[PDB]
Amino acid sequence: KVFGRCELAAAMKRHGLDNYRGYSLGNWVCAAKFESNFNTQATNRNTDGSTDYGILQINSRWWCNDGRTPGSRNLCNIPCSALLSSDITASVNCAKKIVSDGNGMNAWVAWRNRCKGTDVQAWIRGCRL
Ligand SMILES: [Cl-]
Ligand SMILES: [Cl-]
Ligand code: NA
């Protein structure tokens, strides 16, 4: 599913991301835009052999099992394919664990390089929330 901007904002708000660990909703929408262009089916292979999955590009080296990342962890206790669903619940629930682990949203390289320190409220402006 390719989400619209305000549709994704509303779904993330319903699932409890607005101000989660202090990160306003615009931060999460901005991260999703630059990680996946709002496409739940996005995948990208990394140099080390892990793969990033879904609308927030969650990595198989630590967070999910894809059966082909030897020696990896599965800290969200899910198959990585669950992160590609049109229902974003699994992605949101795993992202809450990631952002809680000490490094906040710096875990998402595109957030650090393209959202951090910008006017992220622009990403939800005009939306009915
Ligand atoms: Cl915001
Ligand atoms: Cl933080
Ligand atoms: Na894994």
Q: How far is the CA of 87 from the centre of ligand 3 (A)?
A: 21
* Residues 75, 57, 19: CA angle, nearest 5 degrees: 80
Which experimental technique did the depositors report for determining this structure? X-ray
- Give SS3 for 48: coil
Please tell me whether residue 99 adopts helix, strand or coil conformation: helix
Measure the CA–CA gap between 75 and 90, rounded to whole angstroms.
13
List Cβ neighbours of 45 (8 Å cut-off, separation of 6 or more).
51
The whole-angstrom separation of Cα 104 and Cα 81 is: 24
102: Cβ contacts below 8 Å, ≥ 6 apart: none
Structural domain tally of the chain?
1
Q: What is the DSSP string of 53-88?
A: ETTTTEETTTS-B-S-STT---TT-SBGGGGGSSST
Owner of token pair 């990403």 = 123
Compute the distance from residue 104 Cα to the ligand 2 centre, in Å. 4
The count of C-alpha atoms lying within 13 angstroms of the C-alpha of 19, restricted to the half-sphere facing its C-beta, is 0
1-10-105-81 Cα dihedral, nearest 10 degrees:
-30
The CATH number assigned to the domain holding 102 equals 1.10.530.10
Name residues with Cβ closer than 5 Å to ligand 3, which is an ion: 60, 65, 69, 72, 74
35 classed as catalytic? yes
Q: In which domain, by residue range, is 44 found?
A: 1-129
Distances (CA, A) of 105 to 2, 27, 44, 50, 64: 23, 9, 19, 20, 18
CA 56/CA 29 separation, integer angstroms: 10
Is 7 one of the catalytic residues? no
Q: Is 101 labeled as ligand-binding?
A: yes
How many C-beta atoms surround the C-beta of residue 80 within 10 A? 26
Residue that has been written with the tokens 């793969």 in this structure: 51
Helices (H) and strands (E) in the chain, counts: 4, 3
Q: What phi and psi, each to the nearest 5 degrees, are found at residue 112? A: -60, -40
Given the residues 18, 35, 66, 119, the one annotated as active site: 35
Enter the resolution in angstroms: 1.5
